[PDB]
């Protein structure tokens, strides 16, 4: 749906298939959620995952105690202390009984995402929003869907939620198992909410170094379906090869992303989105359109709330999106959106000039055009 066109697939070169592409693993547009576990216990193993393209850290609260999860949360902070340029996001998976693991464990530790289990209505997401309160106003709520009633109210749930998480095993007639995956991802894509595909795609990586040919295909299809994120479960938690699993994920994502017809993807989006778009959203459209027209390397989005960056991400430009924010809660929450890499800033040329030097160091190159957007609404085009 958000993948290759007839023309895009037929233009796949021999160099893409025969010769391994050499690119920075974190330059990938699709983002990776790793479930932290006993194999991730080591700080040396956590930094290895970051270099292998880890973007979001999952803390599965359905097993274990708070005191052991505090040890992981402290460990990943030390791992993030080692690599200053990169920044991670923290997600907590739920299992009433998890209310003490939400009100006390998530609020104090400062998680970014809440994976609320077995949500059935739009009323349910208001309850988890009320329990969080003003102190938990920055924590994003992500409904997981395992129940048929949740699919029936999916539109009403999507509208209030901060993005949804979907797993193939949770949804289960066996013939119509892929339909749900494709329907929901596309509906999220149009609404602009980020989608996490939780399905364990690489269950072979738990014991074997390289995955089966069918599992590779499965991952590629999910990227081409239009998912923002993918998830490793047993591969990272209790597997023999956790680092090589994330490395393979980023490799497949980068390879699948090379097939995407971004021109078609934009047109598909513009044609389907509701008739009346706001003034701010119109400028965001121009930014993407201009980025494609001049083949720019970056779109720098200056935002505080993370709203402006969330507008660029909806229309999915081919180039990288660089979000610049003063809020450290913003720069960690935007990891849920694909094609978004964010940098924390202090307080026009103030942050844009510094962004170009930082992107050149994380090579972006000299002689490139860059699009800057700030929201009342501004759009700058500067040479590198």
């Amino acid at each position: 749906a958000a993948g290759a066109s007839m023309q895009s697939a037929a233009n796949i070169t021999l160099r893409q298939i025969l010769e391994p592409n050499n690119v920075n693993l974190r330059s990938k547009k699709t983002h990776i959620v790793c479930t932290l576990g006993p194999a991730c216990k080591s700080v040396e193993t956590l930094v290895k995952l970051i270099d292998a393209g880890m973007d979001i850290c999952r803390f599965n609260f359905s097993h274990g105690s708070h005191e052991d999860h505090k040890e992981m949360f402290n460990n990943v902070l030390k791992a993030q202390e080692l690599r200053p340029n990169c920044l991670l996001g923290m997600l907590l998976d739920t299992k009433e009984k998890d209310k003490n693991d939400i009100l006390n464990f998530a609020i104090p530790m400062g998680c970014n995402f809440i994976a609320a289990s077995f949500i059935q209505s739009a009323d349910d997401v208001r309850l988890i929003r009320n329990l969080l309160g003003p102190r938990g106003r920055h924590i994003k709520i992500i409904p997981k869907i395992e129940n048929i009633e949740g699919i029936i109210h999916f539109d009403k749930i999507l509208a209030e939620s901060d993005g949804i998480m979907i797993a193939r095993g949770d949804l289960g007639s066996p013939e119509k198992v892929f339909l749900a995956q494709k329907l929901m991802i596309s509906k999220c894509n149009l609404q602009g909410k980020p989608i996490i595909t939780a399905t364990q795609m690489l269950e072979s990586m738990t014991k074997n170094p390289r995955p089966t040919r069918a599992e590779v295909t499965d991952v590629a299809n999910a990227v081409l379906d239009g998912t923002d994120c993918v998830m490793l479960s047993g591969e990272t938690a209790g597997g023999k090869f956790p680092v090589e699993a994330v490395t393979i994920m980023s490799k497949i994502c980068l390879e699948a992303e090379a097939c995407i017809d971004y021109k078609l993807l934009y047109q598909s989006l513009v044609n389907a989105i509701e008739t009346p778009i706001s003034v701010q959203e119109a400028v965001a459209r121009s930014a993407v359109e201009t980025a494609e027209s001049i083949q720019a390397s970056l779109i720098i989005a200056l935002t505080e709330t993370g709203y402006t960056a969330r507008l660029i991400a909806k229309y999915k430009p081919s180039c990288t999106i660089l979000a610049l924010s003063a809020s450290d809660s913003t720069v960690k929450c935007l990891n849920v959106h694909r094609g978004v890499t964010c940098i924390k800033v202090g307080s026009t040329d103030i942050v844009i000039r510094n962004a170009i030097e930082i992107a050149k160091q994380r090579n972006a190159k000299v002689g490139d055009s860059v699009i800057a957007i700030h929201g009342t609404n501004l759009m700058k085009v500067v040479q590198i």
Copy 2:
């Protein structure tokens, strides 16, 4: 690429997920079934027909001519029992292979050497000349060896990764295997089974160039002129020379496991997506031979991952899907086809046929013939008036192939007097065939076909139908497009 759009996927209704219903044979994607002991019964073959079998694959890696002849005749008995359905006959060749030697690392060309773990023999006597200090795969790509030293009858390698058996499979990435495609057995299989028995397709194994296909066409000759040649792409050389192979071929067969031998594991879907799109653009039929429901061998229901694998193959734009061990030597063969057909149908309801057509039209070579121009008209008009059926009057199958190329949303009803044509057009998706007595006229044949179509509930009273007749591939004829109300 031939799948769902943003809007198509967003418009998936709860009635698709929850409720089920349609006839199994009304599906667009066609199913190839590998025959064996599990479905050897005359009763069980009929059950597969009703489940959605379109082409029968005769795997000639195992079994004798006598074994396959009985299997051939059993299917003909099922053809007698099911008069409406008309199945295609595919013969898959064993082809060339490279094997390891015997055992009681260096690789010697002397195949008599019973060696230790220090030295093992190889079947390919031209290995020293063919390989340069390149990787060598053994035991179905389980053990990997890197070539460092080359000599007159020796090859010195270092084991990169287990314990392997004797006479095991070998692969050579990025080198052209200098072994004949038609082995003395294959030559016998084609001349003494394929032709005399009246097979429709030959799935040629390990096709490396267009010359290989020509070599097979010359062997078939006048007696086997109506048999289609379907190359199997299996090595890197097959990928490199794919275009020229495709142009000479009658269709393409692909198994993910075989392509995933010489190519880095992460890049398997690339070779698939590329070839299916190019086959679509050329209007050449493509068969995904990948075993995608291997659990059905021992399980009544497939994996959730197996289902979406089949669905994505359909949405990639494949004409055919294939069951291998599921139908040949599995506990649940009837259940395998039934689930295959079901997955196809639900996936087909996701296709955005308008976008499919538009992307085809934009990407196909700049100048087209008058015949193809009318074929586009037929498809465009069918979509415009939401016709139930495109009836294609064809002798060679050409006119039907032109319509199929442009992937209409409605079923294509191909009509022919040639038995070969009716069986051959099975490789193209969305095509159902009816054998007809030699064309008495345009009006006569069309009218009689609609009667046959009404009796099968393919159309309804009041539906519009598009008839097309071309004379055929010869330039400068007359082309008819006829729109009729079925009432």
Copy 3:
């Protein structure tokens, strides 16, 4: 609207501007010629045919039935000399008129400040202060604030007061006017019979028995006028086409309803823009031509665009580009009035008309024309979808002709609506069909015999096309036949043939 695009206009070659030699009857836009003394002879009529005349117009505002009968036969004699040409016959009705009265000195000089009284006593010998009006219902049809135009809009008068038997006005501009001059009443529905007994005599005792194809009806104000004329024609006049002339504001207001009942439209700038403010006249013309194009209804541009060619052998530059723009607006026909009827150079007027038409037609972007038609027309019949396929395939393979087999003209009308780049060859056994399709641009006809199958008639039409240099060996041709034309459920056929 149906003209040159950005690309087409920039693609105008130097050859087009400098190098002149195509057959004049090869053009797409059709010509209506007004008949009169200047073209009474069979020899002239034949020369006009060669120059590109398609419809002959009979102006029944003057002349006996006998005079027109002689004219009708002379064109019939011309027809026999040019069997490749099948001419349409149009009758122009007199219709309602409103006029000033007689004057004491046969002329008066009306002045700006002066107040003028208009009386309903048509026997009153008028002067500078008081003039009679033939429309007896004037005082009750007019209110203070209305405008009254005298002598083809030379003098404007603003109504100040209305009484039982007269009206009081103020002359908005100064001019000298003569006796018995035409009047107009902007924003007023003129309550007069659409056809008088004379118009009734012309229709029943000339149009019908002479076999005219069109009646151009003067001063249509509602769809009821069109219905009133159809009833009069009756079963005997069933095949005669009604072409309303829009000549006032009421006709513009109710244009849509009028068009729906119509078989076509005839507009002339001078009359249509009479009650319209000078700057807004082109607006009405673009609106109505576009609306006709979209509906498939033919339109006739009747404005005299080559007036100076009454005296001169060559037109002014302004006159040429005016004709050009009319074609590019998307008019089906252009009309010559005084140029052919009572002018010194009638053959020459038609000759350059065709030449301008050929020149402007070379500018049209047909692809843009087709698209914007399809984008503006919502659900359509199977017959119309097949008509679309025919036009699209013709564009795709670059066919020389679309051959349309048609008994009523329906199928030919369907195709013509989609304005293909190639000529439409219409085949009919019906003599009225063949002479009626003349109002549609790009349609030319052959009368055919009784064909049992499509095969024979198409093949015979191709050999005639070869003879007439409409197609050549190697060209592709598209043939279309609809068994039951305007009736759903039949079989529709599109057939592509390569010429041997």
Copy 4:
């Protein structure tokens, strides 16, 4: 377009157009003569919609020039155009007019009989560094001019067409083609084009034009002309009512243009690769359409920025803001551009233009406005009117 014209309303046809005459997109060139003499009638010509004054005794033109600036000070920047006599490429009378009158005083110079791209260079040489700001607009009066048009247009600032001139050597049936050819070529290049063809000559003696003359100017506007010209009408018994009618026709024809189509036709036909600044100019136009902006405000020094926006023909008015008198008076040949002179020494400049736009009826409170500035780096600002 088919749709645009079929949407022509009864209001458009029956009710008078009450827009301000200076708010029109098509700009008017008026030739100056005895009828224009007085300062009173010349101000009334400005209010009627005059944008460029054409000068066609040396001291006699100086009388008009000073009386024009007196009228301009009494009221809005007017362009000044000088029209050469011509027939020997450059005349001695023309060389004396260019050097001692045109350079000494005007923004545009209309050269006579240009047949190659070397003639425009020759006139550019004669102008020198003092004539750097003066725009050269060749008149096409012969076949060779039409033959090398592409080479001539590329070197020139703009083109001036007369139907009487080009149709003197051309065949009668062909005369209309040359007008449509060159107008489109200019449009696709962004060079302004003046149609000099006298099209309302009846207004010399009559207070109303003939209906034929009306559609002629109407079609010129619809051909895509940047400017229209009055010759004898202004230089005539009714000069004021001739400009008034000329303005009203322009507004009436401008209401028929399918702008979405025009933009699309432009983009599809322009040369494949475009500069970064031109792409930003495209966006400003596309964004103005998407949110129905009342104005595109272009902050430009050389006029180049306003010329890019003018090339893509947006539906809304273009406000060009410049510190240069030269460019403010030079952008008048371009369609739909009204200019304001600002102080030499961006936030206040944008805020100031919006205030004038409220008073000019061009924009209202609550409307969105698009501002564009290119230093070379390139900016686009969307602001709501408060």
